[PDB]
Design an enzyme around this catalytic site. Structure first.
Site, mmCIF file in Angstrom:
data_model
loop_
_atom_site.group_PDB
_atom_site.id
_atom_site.type_symbol
_atom_site.label_atom_id
_atom_site.label_comp_id
_atom_site.label_asym_id
_atom_site.label_seq_id
_atom_site.Cartn_x
_atom_site.Cartn_y
_atom_site.Cartn_z
ATOM 1 N N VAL A 188 -30.838 26.407 -64.643
ATOM 2 C CA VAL A 188 -31.794 27.319 -65.271
ATOM 3 C C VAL A 188 -33.128 26.660 -65.640
ATOM 4 O O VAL A 188 -34.022 27.325 -66.154
ATOM 5 C CB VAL A 188 -31.204 27.951 -66.545
ATOM 6 N N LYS A 227 -22.773 20.145 -63.312
ATOM 7 C CA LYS A 227 -21.360 20.497 -63.305
ATOM 8 C C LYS A 227 -20.509 19.845 -62.213
ATOM 9 O O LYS A 227 -19.366 19.471 -62.469
ATOM 10 C CB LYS A 227 -21.220 22.006 -63.248
ATOM 11 N N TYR A 257 -21.480 31.881 -57.823
ATOM 12 C CA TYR A 257 -20.684 32.877 -58.528
ATOM 13 C C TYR A 257 -20.135 34.016 -57.677
ATOM 14 O O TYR A 257 -19.503 33.789 -56.649
ATOM 15 C CB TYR A 257 -21.488 33.455 -59.695
ATOM 16 N N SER A 286 -26.952 23.181 -65.296
ATOM 17 C CA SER A 286 -25.748 23.439 -64.497
ATOM 18 C C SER A 286 -25.556 22.595 -63.248
ATOM 19 O O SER A 286 -24.432 22.278 -62.883
ATOM 20 C CB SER A 286 -25.679 24.911 -64.100
ATOM 21 N N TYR A 330 -21.639 18.832 -74.018
ATOM 22 C CA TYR A 330 -21.938 19.596 -72.822
ATOM 23 C C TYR A 330 -23.419 19.920 -72.750
ATOM 24 O O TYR A 330 -24.015 19.903 -71.665
ATOM 25 C CB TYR A 330 -21.128 20.884 -72.811
HETATM 26 N N1 LIG Z 1 -27.340 24.546 -69.709
HETATM 27 C C1 LIG Z 1 -26.988 25.990 -69.736
HETATM 28 C C2 LIG Z 1 -26.492 26.441 -68.365
HETATM 29 C C3 LIG Z 1 -27.596 26.769 -67.391
HETATM 30 C C4 LIG Z 1 -27.075 27.421 -66.132
HETATM 31 O O1 LIG Z 1 -26.177 28.286 -66.244
HETATM 32 O O2 LIG Z 1 -27.568 27.071 -65.039
HETATM 33 C C5 LIG Z 1 -25.906 26.249 -70.759
HETATM 34 O O3 LIG Z 1 -25.217 25.276 -71.118
HETATM 35 O O4 LIG Z 1 -25.761 27.414 -71.173
#
Ligand SMILES: N[C@@H](CCC(=O)O)C(=O)O
Ligand SMILES: N[C@@H](CCC(=O)O)C(=O)O
Lengths: 435, 435
Positions: B261, B67, B243, B64, B191
């Site tokens: 994560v 992003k 969040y 993440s 992604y």
């Molecule tokens: N790479 C995880 C996201 C990890 C996160 O939410 O930090 C996914 O695509 O579900």
């Protein structure tokens, strides 16, 4: 000459004043019958300058824009622990949900929404404070930032107290969960007076400025609030000031701000400017239409965004002179982590993280430290590495340093402690004992 | 001497490393079996300095924390209009609700949550871009900020692609509302690779630093991103990065940051520092436990809060010398609204808002402009009013000004235009044509 900012303020008033969408607060007679043909705006700078245009000297009730002042006042009177147990830090829409208070927490979401404001008013002086004291603590805290004794417009207070059924409801619900000790009518009455305090677009700009500087009044230099308290208040203004539209507002504008249903808008951008806007008619979500637009503009035309950096950096280092055997370091500005951190780079950069093989580009760029410095903003620190391009004495000149927070003191102290350890003399020429 | 910051980083690693609560990401085998006994941290400064401690050179998937880089890349490739029509600016919990997309808008809430990230990946190069291009645009944008060619850990990609049912679901739902053109599996695959890019706690600190400075790489001084784009990305990181806990995080910490994560955490405080933290075990909401704590500390011990002002102010004015018939103005630092605004105060303060009767206190404080200046932070502007304490020529020295954004140029230009209009000569001694 005449300063260009006020002229810019006048242009903005005329341009955006071409119209007047929305309408005045219709849920109170005194605010419904208000002239919608008014519109002022002020900018107070940290230094002590005040720029204005339009109806910036007309009074109007501060309503909600008063919430960050009482939250700040209550935080000082009871400290964080006590206030946090009653007021959360989560953003929310004024639409009230009881699930907010059922949580393990038992407290309204934040201090910008009615429920959260009622809880803050109840905490104002202490547990054994009378109704009368809390209301003065309110008018007082606000008055001390505006710079003058303020007053409550009882005509509005009575007008609103007659149709305060919703707030009484929030107050009762809160007592139910034990967030309010006193009576519902008692806190509502005090809360409704607090919102009836009258300010002009200018006062708001000066009040916003106190919060902007970390608690320092720009018109006297006297600390009104602790930096840690002023910080939180601006934090909650940013995250919850514009309610559920805060995400879009923090991106579209960048100015922590709370709006009032009387038409006023408060703004406070940390370390740069206090703002005040006034325009009776409210948009579809309750904010001041032209008021909210004024902020959008200011934010776009002047890049007055919270995310638009504006640090001191290496510019804390006025210059590095190696006359010969001794090196002179003259510091300047307001030194915090940003500045102190650069000083430590200077000190270390006197001969007393990445693999060059892997980053040929970074080594090349580093080769020309003067060029890499101006492209980045580290004042005259490259003058240290250049002094060493033996050193037995280092002089710390602090005549040009306006002030330095605790973090700076410790960081520059430690810096000093580590040089001497190297068999290097260290004289701190600091006239007005600041260190 | 040795710089005290890295030493502080080491102390923090040992202190907070005394424990290791939470656990590794259990919804992927490759991340479950990861050693939880690792923990690094880096700090990259705007100037080009990098401080580290612990396992800061160990690689881990960026997940993440990637992003904000693709949101930034997509914003440049398609511009605001096009991206905003697919990605909103409202904060939200990763828990997906379909009502998000039913709105008149038809778009995920923001670019920090899976649904919002899928929409951003789909916009990466253009409407006629292949699967292969988008994935390189991703790895590319990121690699250009880290300073080196990065790679995708296909072992993780395959591990996650086998259990990517949830994301496929978000992707399908999005296609349903027309937010995604291509296929669900296609955008999910791209992604999931984007999140498999490997970085070290250090790269994150340098990448965070690019965003921190407004798009300028601190290791070369080369603009990687437009200031306006870098701004928004940090805006959405702040309002939605953590969040539904963003309100509490903006107050408790003040550092815009996204967590991964895999254990990594990215931070970027505008105009001050890029951060990188790494600690495999995640807390109860999915963030890096020790990682999130590291940020809390740094923010408390160094006052590295977004609301803790750190401007240049009047310190843009190095000094004002009235040798006799002519006055000399030497500017310094990185001049934006904050600085340019002070210059305009200086210029105006040469003889070429409040009622004193009402504010006796402010007039007294004003009487001593030197004192009121240091208490507030306006460098040496009071030296202008002191020069006039006739002027026929004014010299603008810009040798010490690192740089000045558009707003500064216009403001200082206008300032210049208004002096000449007063029958005053104006020479701008600006060597490396910056004006
Ligand atoms: N790479 C995880 C996201 C990890 C996160 O939410 O930090 C996914 O695509 O579900
Ligand atoms: N004074 C109003 C609040 C106005 C506002 O929400 O801005 C009230 O107590 O209901």
């Amino acid at each position: 000459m005449r300063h260009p900012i006020p002229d810019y303020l006048a242009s903005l008033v005329t341009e955006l004043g071409a119209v007047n969408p929305g309408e005045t607060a219709q849920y109170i007679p005194v605010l419904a019958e208000a002239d919608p043909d008014r519109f002022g705006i002020a900018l107070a700078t940290p230094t002590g300058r005040l720029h204005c245009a339009g109806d910036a000297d007309v009074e109007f009730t501060i309503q909600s824009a008063s919430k960050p002042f009482t939250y700040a006042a209550a935080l000082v009177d009871r400290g964080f622990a006590a206030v946090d147990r009653q007021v959360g830090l989560n953003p929310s829409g004024e639409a009230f949900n009881e699930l907010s208070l059922e949580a393990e927490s038992h407290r309204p979401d934040n201090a910008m929404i009615n429920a959260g404001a009622l809880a803050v008013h109840q905490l104002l002086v202490g547990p054994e404070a009378s109704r009368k004291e809390r209301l003065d603590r309110a008018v007082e805290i606000m008055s001390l930032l505006a710079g003058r004794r303020l007053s409550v417009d009882w005509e509005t207070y009575e007008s609103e107290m007659a149709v305060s059924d919703r707030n009484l409801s929030l107050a009762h619900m809160l007592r139910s969960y034990g967030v309010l000790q006193d009576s519902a009518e008692e806190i509502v009455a005090g809360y409704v007076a607090q919102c009836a305090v009258l300010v002009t677009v200018k006062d708001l700009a000066v009040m916003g400025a106190c919060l902007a500087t970390g608690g320092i009044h720009p018109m006297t230099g006297e600390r009104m609030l602790p930096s840690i308290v002023a910080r939180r208040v601006v934090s909650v203004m940013t995250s919850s000031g514009m309610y559920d539209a805060a995400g879009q507002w923090l991106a579209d504008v960048g100015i922590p701000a709370k709006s009032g249903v009387a038409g006023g808008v408060l703004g406070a951008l940390p370390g740069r400017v206090g703002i005040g806007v006034f325009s009776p008619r409210l948009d579809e979500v309750g904010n001041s239409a032209r008021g909210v637009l004024a902020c959008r503009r200011l934010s776009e035309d002047f890049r007055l965004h919270l995310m638009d950096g504006d640090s001191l950096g290496g510019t804390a280092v006025r210059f590095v002179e190696r006359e010969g055997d001794r090196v002179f370091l003259h510091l300047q500005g307001v030194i915090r982590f940003g500045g102190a951190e650069a000083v430590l780079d200077a000190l270390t950069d006197l001969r007393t993280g990445w693999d060059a093989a892997v980053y040929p580009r970074w080594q090349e760029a580093a080769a020309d430290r003067a060029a890499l410095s101006a492209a980045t903003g580290g004042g005259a620190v490259h003058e240290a590495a250049a002094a060493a391009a033996p050193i037995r004495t280092v002089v710390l000149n602090l005549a040009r340093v306006d002030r330095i927070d605790d973090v700076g003191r410790r960081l520059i102290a430690e810096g000093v402690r580590r040089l001497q350890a190297d068999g290097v003399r260290v004289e701190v020429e600091d006239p007005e004992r600041i260190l």
